[PDB]
Structure formats: structure tokens, C-alpha cells
Design a protein around this ligand. Structure first.
Ligand SMILES: [Ca+2]
Ligand SMILES: [Ca+2]
Length: 292
DNA sequence: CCCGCTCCTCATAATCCTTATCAAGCC
DNA sequence: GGGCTTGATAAGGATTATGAGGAGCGG
């Protein structure tokens, strides 16, 4: 039935709130303004996409040409049910600001303000701060907009474990890596890892995970991204594994968590020190994540 | 015609996810 | 003593996140 806090947590990772302003001769002012909300996932998560549709009970799930599909919402009534939800189950990443702007533009469209010259100017000023902002065409066409400020989003606190389970279902990773350790009996070793990746803008949120889960550490990526990594076994077995079983994943990634947990059990018996348990771990690794 | 809403498909690239190698150390 | 663990430390590449717009509908 999909938990609402799981929804906000998943949309916080995957999903986009957009305000499209494209030149269209069909409109009196020669400009088409439309609000849209789209989650774009790999086809393997087609089932999850349809579950999200059932959650909102609006929009449709479209099967793209590639190994990907989208849950899309592009109607007034539809967006109204989406805003009804996020006004009660808000996002907590920087995407929240993109949502509040998407909400401002939506209200103006409900007033037909996109059909007037002044209203269209307000909508262009808003789009100028949503996601990637204006392009080189809108800058040329709409010079002199009253530049509005991108809404500020207070520092985030994780307040519901189901939110984190959706945020993890969207941007988490369960790694079972076997590397070569010359100082070991078998010459190899097993490195388990839990990973939550995000951009520098939400570094506060990522460090929040350290206190919420009570473990892990923050890692900075030179390219401009921050990771939350739990890399010690004792915490993975006692904290992470129990957490994502009590607050389980719903997408395709849950399968990887299942195989991930199976490796945890073989490592709790010290089986990973033998060749039989190590071989079984490799058989498990070879069938999870990028090997399905 | 002109005007307005929205289904449905196609497009792009980087923020993600994923897979790595390593040695100081604990236990 | 010395296996075995674990944060530090890279980097790959595709699933994403963001997006454009034709054409079918009614007035
Ligand atoms: Ca994201
Ligand atoms: Ca994902």
C-alpha cells in the first residue's frame, strides 16, 4: 500500500518537479506554461512505479523506449493531489525548494495567470530558479523579469524511519566486494559496505545519518558529492540489517539487500574465512546490483 | 482559426550508485 | 605474535533527473 513517509523519502531522491515554458504558437501569448511531476526509473522498477501511481491514485506510468519508464503527472487535478500529499509529508532535501517553486507556479496556473503578460512574467521568474533555470532563449525573450529568490530550506532532521527507507531505496547501495589481501590465509577478503550518496548541497542531511542510525562516517568525493558509508561489520549486522528489515525496501534494490543480508550471515559464522563460504559469497555477489 | 489542456513519446548527461585497491591498525 | 578488519581513497558509467513538444481532443 506504500507508506506516505516512504513516498516523500523516495521522491526526495528520485523524482522531479518541473515548470516548462516553451514557445508555442497555439497560445495567445505564444508561450506554453505547464506544471509537471515525473519520476524516471529503470524498467526493472516498473512494479514500484505502478505502486506509486496507486499511492497517489492519479497520473499514469509510461513505458519509455529504453530500459526505463516514468510515472508522470501533468494535470491540474493530478498536481492538486500531489501537493495535497507533500504539504503534509514534505521533502527535506534541497529538492524541497524546487517543490515550493513548483507549487507557486501551479497556483498561478490555477488562476489562469499564465494567460496574462504580468502573470507569465512571474512564472518565468519562478522557472528561473527551478532546477537548471532559464535557458538562452528565455533570457532573450523575457529580459527584465523581477528576479525572485530561490526559497530557503531549513536544516533537515530525519523524523520518520520510513522516509529513510524510501531515501535508501532511491539512492542507497549494498556492496559485497571481494579484494586481494596478501596477509590473509586465503589471500582474499570480503568488504561489506552501506552507501548513501548525495550532492554537496545536502551535506548536512548526509551527516545527519551518522546520528540517526548511530553509526557510519562521511566521505567527500572530489567530483563534488558526499557519501555516508557504514563500513564496519559489527554495525552493519546489528544496526543496518535490522533497520532495513523492520523498515523494508519496496523497489528492485530490496533484492540486493536480501543477498546483502545473506552475505552478512555467512560472515557472522566466520564462514568467509573458508574457501566454501568465500566461494558462496562470490556466487552471491555475482548475482546482485549490476549483475542481474 | 485561434486558444487551451494534456496524453504519449523521445532526448540528454551527471548526480548518483557501484566497484575498486590499500595498509595502518586492532583484537 | 599476525591474520583480519576498516576507514581512506580513488574511479567507472549508467540510472537517473531534467526536459521538449507533436497531436489528439473539445469548445
Ligand atoms: Ca536525487
Ligand atoms: Ca535509484
Amino acid at each position: 500500500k506504500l507508506n506516505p513517509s516512504y513516498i516523500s523519502g523516495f521522491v526526495d531522491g528520485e523524482g522531479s518537479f518541473m515548470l516548462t515554458i516553451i514557445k508555442d504558437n497555439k497560445y495567445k501569448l505564444g508561450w506554453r506554461v505547464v506544471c509537471r511531476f515525473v519520476i524516471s526509473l529503470h524498467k526493472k522498477d516498473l512494479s514500484l512505479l505502478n505502486k506509486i501511481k496507486e499511492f497517489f491514485d492519479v497520473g499514469n506510468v509510461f513505458l519509455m523506449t529504453k530500459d526505463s519508464a516514468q510515472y508522470r503527472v501533468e494535470s491540474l487535478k493530478g498536481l492538486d493531489l500531489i501537493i495535497n500529499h507533500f504539504d503534509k509529508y514534505p521533502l527535506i532535501t534541497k529538492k524541497q525548494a524546487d517543490y515550493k517553486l513548483f507549487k507557486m507556479a501551479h497556483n498561478l496556473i490555477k488562476n489562469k495567470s499564465h494567460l496574462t503578460k504580468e502573470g507569465l512574467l512571474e512564472l518565468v521568474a519562478i522557472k528561473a530558479v527551478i532546477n537548471n533555470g532559464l535557458n538562452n532563449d528565455l533570457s532573450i525573450a523575457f529580459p527584465g523579469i523581477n528576479t525572485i529568490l530561490r526559497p530557503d530550506t531549513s536544516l533537515p532532521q530525519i523524523l520518520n524511519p520510513f522516509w529513510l527507507s524510501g531515501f535508501v531505496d532511491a539512492e542507497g547501495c549494498f556492496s559485497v566486494v571481494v579484494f586481494k589481501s596478501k596477509t590473509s590465509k586465503l589471500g582474499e577478503a570480503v568488504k561489506l559496505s552501506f552507501i548513501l550518496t548525495q550532492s554537496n548541497r545536502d551535506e548536512y542531511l548526509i551527516k545527519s545519518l551518522i546520528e540517526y542510525l548511530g553509526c557510519g562516517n562521511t566521505s567527500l568525493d572530489p567530483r563534488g558529492t558526499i557519501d555516508f558509508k557504514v563500513t564496519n561489520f559489527s554495525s552493519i549486522k546489528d544496526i543496518i540489517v535490522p533497520f532495513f528489515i523492520k523498515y523494508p525496501l519496496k523497489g528492485n534494490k530490496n533484492l540486493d539487500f536480501t543477498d546483502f543480508c545473506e552475505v552478512v550471515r555467512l560472515m557472522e559464522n566466520k564462514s568467509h574465512l573458508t574457501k566454501e563460504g568465500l566461494d558462496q559469497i562470490k556466487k552471491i555477489r555475482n548475482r546482485m546490483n549490476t549483475n542481474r
